[PDB]
UniProtKB/Swiss-Prot annotation, chain A:
UniProt record similarity statement: Belongs to the sigma-70 factor family. RpoD/SigA subfamily.
Domain notes: Contains 4 domains, connected by flexible linkers. In the active conformation, the domains are in an extended conformation, each making extensive interactions with the RNA polymerase catalytic core. In the autoinhibited state, sigma-70 factor domain-1 packs closely together with sigma-70 factor domains-2 and -4, contrary to the extended conformation that is seen when the protein is part of the RNA polymerase holoenzyme.
Domain of life according to the entry: Bacteria
Organism: Escherichia coli (strain K12)
The protein's name: RNA polymerase sigma factor RpoD
Purpose: Sigma factors are initiation factors that promote the attachment of RNA polymerase to specific initiation sites and are then released. This sigma factor is the primary sigma factor during exponential growth. Preferentially transcribes genes associated with fast growth, such as ribosomal operons, other protein-synthesis related genes, rRNA- and tRNA-encoding genes and prfB.
Residue range from the parent sequence: 94 to 143 of 613
Coiled coil residues, start to end: none
Subcellular location: Cytoplasm
UniProtKB/Swiss-Prot annotation, chain B:
EC number annotated for this UniProt entry: 2.7.7.6
Subunit structure: The RNAP catalytic core consists of 2 alpha, 1 beta, 1 beta' and 1 omega subunit. When a sigma factor is associated with the core the holoenzyme is formed, which can initiate transcription. The rRNA transcription and antitermination complex (rrnTAC) consists of RNAP, NusA, NusB, NusE (rpsJ), NusG, SubB, ribosomal protein S4, DNA and precursor rRNA; S4 is more flexible than other subunits.
Record organism: Escherichia coli (strain K12)
Name recorded for this polypeptide: DNA-directed RNA polymerase subunit omega
SMART domains: RNA_pol_Rpb6
Gene name of this polypeptide: rpoZ
Catalytic activity: RNA(n) + a ribonucleoside 5'-triphosphate = RNA(n+1) + diphosphate
Keywords: DNA-directed RNA polymerase, Nucleotidyltransferase, Transcription, Transferase
This protein's record includes keyword Lyase: no
Classification via NCBIfam families: rpoZ
Curated annotation (Swiss-Prot), chain C:
SMART domains, per database record: RPOLA_N
Subunit structure: The RNAP catalytic core consists of 2 alpha, 1 beta, 1 beta' and 1 omega subunit. When a sigma factor is associated with the core the holoenzyme is formed, which can initiate transcription. The rRNA transcription and antitermination complex (rrnTAC) consists of RNAP, NusA, NusB, NusE (rpsJ), NusG, SubB, ribosomal protein S4, DNA and precursor rRNA; S4 is more flexible than other subunits.
The EC number(s) this enzyme carries: 2.7.7.6
Family matches, as Pfam families: RNA_pol_Rpb1_1 (PF04997), RNA_pol_Rpb1_2 (PF00623), RNA_pol_Rpb1_3 (PF04983), RNA_pol_Rpb1_4 (PF05000), RNA_pol_Rpb1_5 (PF04998)
Disulfide bonds: none
InterPro entries, sorted: DNA-dir_RpoC_beta_prime (IPR045867), DNA-dir_RpoC_beta_prime_bact (IPR012754), RNA_pol_asu (IPR000722), RNA_pol_N (IPR006592), RNA_pol_Rpb1_1 (IPR007080), RNA_pol_Rpb1_3 (IPR007066), RNA_pol_Rpb1_3_sf (IPR042102), RNA_pol_Rpb1_4 (IPR007083)
HAMAP family on file: RNApol_bact_RpoC
Name of the protein this chain belongs to: DNA-directed RNA polymerase subunit beta'
A single GO cellular-component term on record: cytosolic DNA-directed RNA polymerase complex
Effect noted on mutating residue 767 to A/C: Resistant to antibiotics salinamide A and B
Chemical reaction(s) catalysed: RNA(n) + a ribonucleoside 5'-triphosphate = RNA(n+1) + diphosphate
Curated annotation (Swiss-Prot), chain D:
Organism: Escherichia coli (strain K12)
Lineage: Bacteria, Pseudomonadati, Pseudomonadota, Gammaproteobacteria, Enterobacterales
Task of the protein: DNA-dependent RNA polymerase (RNAP) catalyzes the transcription of DNA into RNA using the four ribonucleoside triphosphates as substrates. Resistance to the antibiotics salinamide A, salinamide B, rifampicin, streptolydigin, CBR703, myxopyronin, and lipiarmycin can result from mutations in this protein.
Post-translational events: Acetylated on several lysine residues in the presence of glucose.
Subunit structure comment from the entry: The RNAP catalytic core consists of 2 alpha, 1 beta, 1 beta' and 1 omega subunit. When a sigma factor is associated with the core the holoenzyme is formed, which can initiate transcription. The rRNA transcription and antitermination complex (rrnTAC) consists of RNAP, NusA, NusB, NusE (rpsJ), NusG, SubB, ribosomal protein S4, DNA and precursor rRNA; S4 is more flexible than other subunits. In pull-down experiments interacts with CedA.
Family membership: Belongs to the RNA polymerase beta chain family.
Superkingdom, natural source: Bacteria
Descriptive protein name: DNA-directed RNA polymerase subunit beta
Biotechnology section: Co-administration of salinamide and rifampicin or salinamide and myxopyronin suppresses the emergence of resistance to both antibiotics.
Length: 50, 79, 1334, 50
């Protein structure tokens, strides 16, 4: 059957739930990402002077 | 009056060319380029056209000759 | 203005070329003030201004500008009709499959990529992957994957690999494909390899490919990139009264599409995860596919409503689409509608019409005459003058009516006499008065039915309605030459009362000088209306050449006949009024008057008949009453006798003597016998009951009962209904279709009790339900028949061919059902026909046969005539007039131009409402046997070895009075050519016993007959002759399973008896239950049995549709010796051995079923191999086109003449022509086509006659019959294939093909609104065709 | 004969077959299937003969 809401449910049904600590772990990965892009800004002097 | 169109079918055949010929003739009598060649009995130009067909003095050939004659008189009336 | 309509695909560059704006926002209009929102679905700079020549802001309000655009807000200041015209577009972010090229049954993306549709939907719904030209490493091109297989292929091959998913993948597939390389590939696969059904699918795909490349299309246009939008005034959002709006649901659809497109652009801005954008691309696919054609998904419903909304293909396709609701039939101004009524004071060229309708219809004519005559200074004054209805306008209206025909129309307009013109006579009243004789043409009774008037505005339409559609022109049906202005009910009663004779009346046997003193005697009251009287009448006749020869005499007639004689015109003889003049007789009277004196005396004669019929029906006082239905004194006696006989059968069933079924059959036979005795009692108690006296004792005569006159005149009803009023009424049938053993022994003059009436109610309700359903199906049959045959127009004057079919009379088993005369009357001869003395030319080769020529046919002894038929004509794109015939409202030959397909299909489908041993020779003559091969037996009789024998009873005049399909192996008493007598059973076959008769005479033996296996030993109780008889397939053992029992002959010497004349013996193979009566070494004679083998309207819509019959008659392909092959597969191999040609044909026959031929015989091509119905395909493919058109016309004329409805055969023949236009070519040759390609017969014919006129070889074809719902869509003109049937498949099939439509045949010209190339417009199209490209 | 046609053997595969054959396309679950077959013919709410 086509019923693309059900195809959406089956496409997302493979992704499983998170524990209450895995959210903090993903948030710390987000912190690592913004940390590394701000440290990438930290080497570039023209953005600083801008 | 004109109840059946049978005599006009006997003069002009094909029963469909009759409509076109009578239409052209009745336009020649309604738009005032001409005037009837038969006495009218307070008929409309339809019935007068069919009566001019039944008297034999109108068909496609006579209308073509008369129309070319009017065109030749226009060419003579250019001056 | 323009020529042929072209259709193709839409490139995104083409779509940006159409559109005058991108619709970026889903708003429609501003809510507070209702100005349109920029730039929503209703915009200004995209589509147009709201008001006539005015910007939206107001900077440009007048005609000071028309070219400018306002720079505050974009408005191109023009007419607002431009807003009806300019289109928009939507830039779709992700591409999207077009649902019409995805979900129609011959799917185009499906068999263009050669990929199954479920995998394509699996790609488009992001469930899988597909490789897109991913090189050659491990993965093929069309090889799909899954996600895990995609990770497999990516980790195993990191690069040189390409596989997307969704609409991008299908678009890359269609873009990547090189077409002509695969064209070469499939041509090689169709040259060397042969995989029959699969290569038929393959040659269909290569037909699609080389049709696609021949067009100007690209495949990736089947995926939408930029979606066009419709103009606003086609999807309007207009105010109703009350501040509430009506939107069309296309606004919902475009709002949803624009909304999800903006959402997908917004998601791809924010770099969404893959699950979300795959969700959104599936949603945008669903939104577009719901906009293009909602209903091929889960049926996305609208808001605040459960009802499913209406998409674009809902607006094209169907009963409510533009093709059938607003193009083929339009609602029309200058029309009116009111209840109809009689008004018998009219001549039939005129009808009544009300003054109020005549004022409302003819308003602009009255306006014109009033401003011409100066009574109204301006036209508003003319409006107020005709509004107040002042006394001066009625003379004006009488001037504008006088010679102006109106069109009268009844709503079921089946045949072409439903629209007729009249001249109006103004009526004080509100009901259209309609002339009575015309009403039988309309099928209009006056029980409240209401009719519609239309007004020819222009001058040509007035001349059309007078010359073609005036009521005095249509006095002959287009279905047959019978009069359709037949006098119907009161007038025939007035006649049948007027022309009759009672044995004693006033003025009995006096003498009269003419009709005038007949009228003076009747109207003074001295002599009665009907008394036998010698009068002097003067009849004229056409003896010389159009000359009225007068003869006068004293005819012995009645008074009323003489009074009617004043009304007969000059030409007719007196014998037309000397009989009783029922309905049949008065129809023959009008028919003879038309076929002699032409049109004008017949019209004025029909008017005078109607007047005198109504007048003397008023003078008749013919009145029904309760004493007018005489009950027989013999009624209750016969009912009591039958009530004793059913008690006899009741006692015989309670005695256990009979079973139930034979009891039931005996009881129903004796009740039918009692009903027949009651009918023959009541008829003799009605019709001769009047017995009176003159100059003697007594004398009987026909009765002056009221109901007998109303049944004998044929006015209303016949003796079935008179039977149900006087005698017992019938035997009713229960809802089973079973029929009750206790019939209704009470008529309506007596009472019916509750149970009898309750039983009768079921028959009444079944009748009503059947009339409703048959009305619907007859409408559908008419529609299919006209839509298969509007393209056919009489176009050429003559083709000059020698083709034709063979008209013979249709006698079959009984007497004549339709003679030779009224079949061939009206047609034309192909070759000259000759007298029974040969080399005597009675007609030349091609003359129009009229009634004197059929008189010349009947004065001689002709029986069969070759006739030019329209199904075998030679003309391109029509039927030449000299081949068609003559039958029309006129009597002459058909004119060049007039559409006959439409009149033919109407005359077939119009009576669709009305639709539902041994030889016992009757007549005497001589005997003839065609295709007979027989042998004299020992008993002096004659046994027949050929089953094609046709028995003809030929009298002294050569014609055939009876024919009998002679069964195989009958016992003839007389031979051939001997004069036979009536009642003499010549051939007496055994119909329960299939004969195994021979030509030989000798000792019957057993060959390959093993006891206990192929044959059992039976010892008879009755006869006692024990024998070895062949058994069934279950009991015959594995040795003798395939081994068959055979019978063969020797003489006294032991040598094998050969057939006298040939060298083959008679070795015959017996089936199961074939009883061996005569054993080994037993003498027989010539032809003795070696053994014995004991035991409505949807018919028409099956014939013209030509559906395959359930049990087909099997027929031999080529003529040759029949033989058997292998045994016991469920089938057997039927092998043919032609003498000259190459033999090796064999056909699978399911060998359980009884065959016809024996193995020793020989069959002709097209001869039957078994019995039952046969497909028209077989008859066309084997016998010939003449045979299949004869088969259709004889079968459907059996179906019509069962009801007793006459339809001339021209109409059925031209529908047969329109069936078989397509024909597949076998040998290509010098032509361009293919070995399996289906192209129309007229197109290959003009190709060959260009090549065959040259020295090259032509293209041989195979004619192929198609049904009416399939020969109408397989057409070279797609609007005639899209106007009625399945629309989506036709538009997509003609959109992938780039097909060009040249308007070709009256459907497109009704669609596009120009003249019709059949009627008066034929001269216009001929002038244009002479002008066009010359 | 009907048992020889039938694929399933026990109660749970029967409920899984019904729950897969009423809401197709989605994977089944034991207690949801039990509540479904409860709510088809044997619940007082969604099924009623008067
Ligand atoms: Mg009615
Ligand atoms: Zn503006
Ligand atoms: Zn022809």
């Amino acid at each position: 059957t086509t019923d693309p809401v059900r195809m959406y449910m089956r496409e997302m049904g493979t992704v499983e739930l998170l524990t209450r600590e895995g959210e903090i772990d993903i948030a710390k990965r987000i912190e690592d990402g913004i940390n590394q892009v701000q440290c990438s800004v930290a080497e570039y002097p023209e953005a600083i002077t801008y | 009056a004109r109840v059946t169109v049978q005599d006009a079918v006997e003069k002009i055949g094909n029963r469909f060319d009759l409509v076109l010929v009578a239409a052209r003739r009745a336009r020649q009598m309604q738009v005032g380029g001409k005037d009837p060649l038969v006495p009218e009995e307070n008929d409309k130009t339809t019935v007068i056209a069919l009566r001019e067909i039944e008297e034999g003095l109108i068909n496609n050939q006579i209308l073509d000759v008369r129309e070319r004659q009017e065109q030749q008189e226009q060419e003579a009336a250019e001056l | 203005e323009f020529d042929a309509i072209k259709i193709a695909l839409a490139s995104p560059d083409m779509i940006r070329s159409w559109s005058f704006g991108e619709v970026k926002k889903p708003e429609t209009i501003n809510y507070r003030t209702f100005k349109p929102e920029r730039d929503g679905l209703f915009c200004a700079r995209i589509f147009g201004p709201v008001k006539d020549y005015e910007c939206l802001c107001g900077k440009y309000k007048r005609l000071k500008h028309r070219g400018v655009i306002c720079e505050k807000c974009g408005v191109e200041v023009t007419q607002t009709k431009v807003r009806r015209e300019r289109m928009g577009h939507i830039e779709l972010a992700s591409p999207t499959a077009h649902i019409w090229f995805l979900k129609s049954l011959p799917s185009r993306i499906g068999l263009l990529l050669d990929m199954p549709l479920r995998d394509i939907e699996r790609v488009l719904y992001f469930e899988s992957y597909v490789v897109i030209e991913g090189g050659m490493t491990n993965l093929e091109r069309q090889q799909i994957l899954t996600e895990e297989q995609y990770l497999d292929a990516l980790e195993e091959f990191g690069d040189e690999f390409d596989a997307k998913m969704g609409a991008e993948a299908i678009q890359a597939l269609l873009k990547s494909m090189d077409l002509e390389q695969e064209c070469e590939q499939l041509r090689e696969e169709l040259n060397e390899t042969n995989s029959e059904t699969k290569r038929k699918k393959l040659t269909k795909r290569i037909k699609l490919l080389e049709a696609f490349v021949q067009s100007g299309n690209k495949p990736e246009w089947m995926i939408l990139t930029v979606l066009p939008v419709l103009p606003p005034d086609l999807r309007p959002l207009v105010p109703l009264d009350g501040g509430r709006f009506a939107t069309s649901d296309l606004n919902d659809l475009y709002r949803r599409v624009i909304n999800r497109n903006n959402r997908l652009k917004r998601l791809l801005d924010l770099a969404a995860p893959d699950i979300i954008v795959r969700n959104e691309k599936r949603m945008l696919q669903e939104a577009v596919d719901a906009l293009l054609d909602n209903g091929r998904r889960g049926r996305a419903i609208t808001g605040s409503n459960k009802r499913p909304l209406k998409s674009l293909a809902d607006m094209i396709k169907g009963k409510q689409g533009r093709f059938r609701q607003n193009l083929l039939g339009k609602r029309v101004d200058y029309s009116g509608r009111s209840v109809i009524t009689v008004g018998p004071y009219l001549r039939l060229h005129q009808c009544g019409l009300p003054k109020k309708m005549a004022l409302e219809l003819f308003k602009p004519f009255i306006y014109g005459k009033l401003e011409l005559r100066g009574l109204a200074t301006t036209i508003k004054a003319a409006k107020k003058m005709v509004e107040r209805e002042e006394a001066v306008v009625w003379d004006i209206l009488d001037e504008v009516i006088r010679e102006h025909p109106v069109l009268l129309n009844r709503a079921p307009t089946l045949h072409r006499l439903g629209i007729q013109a009249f001249e109006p006579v103004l009526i004080e009243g509100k009901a259209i008065q309609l002339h009575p004789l015309v009403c039988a043409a309309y099928n209009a009774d006056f029980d409240g039915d209401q009719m519609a008037v239309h007004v020819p505005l222009t001058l040509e339409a007035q001349l059309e309605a007078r010359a073609l559609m005036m009521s005095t022109n249509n006095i002959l049906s287009p279905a047959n030459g019978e009069p359709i202005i037949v006098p119907s009910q009161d007038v025939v009663l007035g006649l049948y009362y007027m022309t009759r004779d009672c044995v004693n009346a006033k003025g009995e046997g006096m003498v009269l000088t003419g009709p005038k003193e007949a009228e003076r005697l009747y109207r003074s009251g001295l002599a009665s209306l009907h008394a036998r009287v010698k009068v002097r009448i003067t009849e004229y006749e056409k003896d010389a050449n159009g000359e009225l020869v007068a003869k006068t005499s004293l005819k012995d007639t009645t008074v009323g006949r003489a009074i009617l004689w004043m009304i007969v015109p000059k030409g007719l003889p007196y014998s037309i009024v000397n009989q009783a003049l029922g309905k049949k007789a008065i129809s023959k009277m009008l028919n003879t008057c038309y076929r002699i004196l032409g049109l004008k005396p017949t019209v004025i004669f029909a008017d005078q008949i109607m007047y005198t019929g109504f007048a003397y029906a008023a003078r008749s006082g013919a009145s029904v009453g309760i004493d007018d239905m005489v009950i027989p004194e013999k009624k209750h006696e016969i009912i009591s006798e039958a009530e004793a006989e059913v008690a006899e059968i009741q006692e015989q069933f309670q005695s256990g003597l009979v079973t139930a079924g034979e009891r039931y059959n005996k009881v129903i036979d004796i009740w039918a016998a009692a009903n027949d005795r009651v009918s023959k009692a009541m008829m003799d108690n009605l019709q001769t009951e009047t017995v009176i006296n003159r100059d003697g004792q007594e004398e009987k005569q026909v009765s002056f009962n009221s109901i007998y006159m109303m049944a004998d005149s044929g006015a209303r009803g016949s003796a079935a209904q008179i039977r149900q009023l006087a005698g017992m009424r019938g035997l009713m049938a229960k809802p089973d279709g079973s029929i009750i053993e206790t019939p209704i022994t009470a008529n309506f003059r007596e009472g019916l009790n509750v149970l009898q009436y309750f039983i009768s109610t079921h028959g009444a309700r079944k009748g009503l339900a059947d009339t409703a359903l048959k009305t619907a199906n007859s409408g559908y049959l008419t529609r299919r028949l006209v839509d298969v045959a509007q393209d056919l127009v009489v176009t050429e004057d003559d083709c000059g061919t020698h083709e034709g079919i063979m008209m013979t009379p249709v006698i079959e088993g009984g007497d004549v059902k339709e003679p030779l005369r009224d079949r061939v009357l009206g047609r034309v001869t192909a070759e000259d026909v000759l007298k029974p003395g040969t080399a005597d030319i009675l007609v030349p080769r091609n003359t129009l046969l009229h009634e004197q020529w059929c008189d010349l046919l009947e004065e001689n002894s002709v029986d069969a005539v070759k006739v030019r038929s329209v199904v075998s004509c030679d003309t391109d794109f029509g039927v030449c007039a000299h081949c068609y015939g003559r039958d029309l409202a006129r009597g002459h030959i058909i004119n060049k131009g007039e559409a006959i397909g439409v009149i033919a299909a109407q005359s077939i489908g119009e009576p669709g409402t009305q639709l539902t041993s041994s030889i016992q020779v009757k007549n005497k003559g001589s005997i003839k046997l065609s295709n007979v091969k027989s042998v004299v037996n020992s008993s002096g009789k004659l046994v027949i070895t050929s089953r094609n024998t046709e028995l003809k009873l030929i009298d002294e005049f050569g014609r055939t009075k009876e024919s009998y399909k002679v069964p195989y192996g009958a016992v003839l008493a007389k031979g051939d050519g001997e004069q036979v007598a009536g009642g003499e059973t010549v051939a007496n076959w055994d119909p329960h016993t299939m004969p195994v008769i021979t030509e030989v005479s000798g000792f019957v033996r057993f060959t390959d007959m093993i006891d206990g296996q192929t044959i059992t030993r039976q010892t008879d109780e009755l006869t006692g002759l024990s024998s070895l008889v062949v058994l069934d397939s279950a009991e015959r053992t594995a040795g003798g399973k395939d081994l068959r029992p055979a019978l063969k002959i020797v003489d006294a010497q032991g040598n094998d008896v050969l057939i006298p004349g040939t060298d083959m013996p008679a070795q015959y193979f017996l089936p199961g239950k074939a009883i061996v009566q005569l054993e080994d070494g037993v003498q027989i004679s010539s032809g003795d049995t070696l053994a014995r083998i004991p035991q409505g309207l949807p018919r028409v819509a099956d014939l013209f549709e030509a559906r395959r019959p359930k049990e087909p008659a099997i027929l031999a392909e080529i003529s040759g010796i029949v033989s058997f092959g292998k045994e016991t597969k469920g089938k057997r191999r039927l092998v043919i051995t032609p003498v000259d040609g190459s033999d090796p044909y064999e056909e699978m026959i399911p060998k359980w079923r009884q065959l016809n031929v024996f193995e020793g015989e020989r069959v002709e091509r097209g001869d039957v191999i078994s019995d039952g119905p046969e497909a028209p395909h077989d008859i066309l493919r084997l016998r010939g086109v003449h045979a299949v058109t004869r088969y259709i016309v004889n079968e459907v004329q059996d179906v019509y003449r069962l009801q007793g409805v006459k339809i001339n055969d021209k109409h059925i023949e031209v529908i047969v022509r329109q069936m078989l236009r397509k024909a597949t070519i076998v040998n290509a040759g010098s032509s361009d086509f293919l070995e399996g390609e289906q192209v129309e017969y007229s197109r290959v014919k003009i190709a060959n006659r260009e090549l065959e006129a040259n020295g090259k070889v032509g293209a041989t074809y195979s004619r192929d019959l198609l049904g009416i719902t399939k020969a109408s869509l397989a057409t070279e003109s797609f609007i005639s294939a899209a106007s009625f049937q399945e629309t989506t498949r036709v538009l997509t099939e003609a959109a992938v093909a780039g097909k060009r439509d040249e308007l070709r045949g009256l459907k497109e010209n009704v669609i596009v609104g120009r003249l019709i190339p059949a009627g008066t417009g034929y001269a216009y199209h001929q002038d244009r065709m002479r002008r066009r490209a010359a | 004969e009907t048992l020889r046609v039938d694929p399933t053997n026990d109660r749970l595969s029967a409920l899984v077959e019904i729950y897969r054959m009423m809401r197709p396309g989605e994977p089944p679950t034991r207690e949801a299937a039990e509540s479904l077959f409860e709510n088809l013919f044997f619940s007082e709410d969604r099924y009623d003969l008067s």
